[PDB]
Each structure stands twice: as C-alpha cells, then as structure tokens.
Amino acid sequence: TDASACNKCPDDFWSNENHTSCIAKEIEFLSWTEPFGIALTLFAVLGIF
Amino acid sequence: ILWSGFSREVPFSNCSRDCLAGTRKGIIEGEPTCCFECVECPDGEYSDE
Ligand SMILES: *[C@@H]1O[C@H](CO)[C@@H](O)[C@H](O)[C@H]1NC(C)=O
Numbered sequence: 001t002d003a004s005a006c007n008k009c010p011d012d013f014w015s016n017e018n019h020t021s022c023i024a025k026e027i028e029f030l031s032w033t034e035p036f037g038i039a040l041t042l043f044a045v046l047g048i049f
Numbered sequence: 050i051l052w053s054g055f056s057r058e059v060p061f062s063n064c065s066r067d068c069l070a071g072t073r074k075g076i077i078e079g080e081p082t083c084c085f086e087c088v089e090c091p092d093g094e095y096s097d098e
C-alpha cells in the first residue's frame with residue numbers, strides 16, 4: 001500500500017486484473033491432453049485403424 | 050537586468066524539469082510537490098499539456 005508508482009512485472013509474468021500480484025503468462029499450445037487435441041488424435045487413430 | 054551581474058537569461062530554479070507532453074508527473078516519497086518524476090503515460094492514454 002501507499003506505493004508511489006507501479007513497478008514493472010518480470011518479462012515472463014503478467015499482472016492480474018486487480019494488479020496486486022503478477023502471474024506467468026499463460027502458456028498456450030495444442031496439448032495432447034486437451035479435449036480438442038485428444039479428439040483429433042482419436043480421429044487420426046481411428047482412421048489409421 | 051543583468052542576472053548574475055553579467056548574464057541576460059532568467060535562471061532555472063525549479064526542483065525538477067517540466068514533464069513532456071507524453072509523460073505525467075509522478076511523486077517521490079519524502080519530497081515536496083515541486084519535485085516529481087516524468088512517468089510515461091500508459092498505452093491508450095494521452096496528455097496534451
Ligand atoms: C484481485 O484479483 C487477484 C487475482 O489474483 C486476487 O488477489 C483477488 O482475487 C482480488 N483481490 C485482491 C485484494 O487482490
């Protein structure tokens with residue numbers, strides 16, 4: 001509290017909505033365990049069969 | 050007026066230099082209002098004065 005100015009959050013992280021503590025930037029890719037990824041791999045496996 | 054007895058320009062006697070148009074004044078803890086910083090405006094915000 002009573003902070004004169006907002007300090008820069010580290011590069012890999014990003015501030016939340018309340019700008020209290022900054023968390024890491026959400027990684028993002030087509031995960032194997034993701035429902036879309038699992039559906040696509042199931043379709044590919046069924047087609048190979 | 051000869052300012053220091055020889056010069057002809059009004060001396061600068063402000064605590065901090067005037068902030069530019071793109072910047073805004075930021076406080077310094079323990080210092081009076083005449084002393085401030087020049088924090089840049091965030092994205093999406095502007096300052097003309
Ligand atoms: C503001 O949002 C953040 C999100 O991490 C969290 O601290 C809390 O839910 C909210 N309140 C405060 C005081 O931070």
Ligand SMILES: [Ca+2]
Nearest residue numbers: 078079080081
């Ligand atoms: Ca003081």
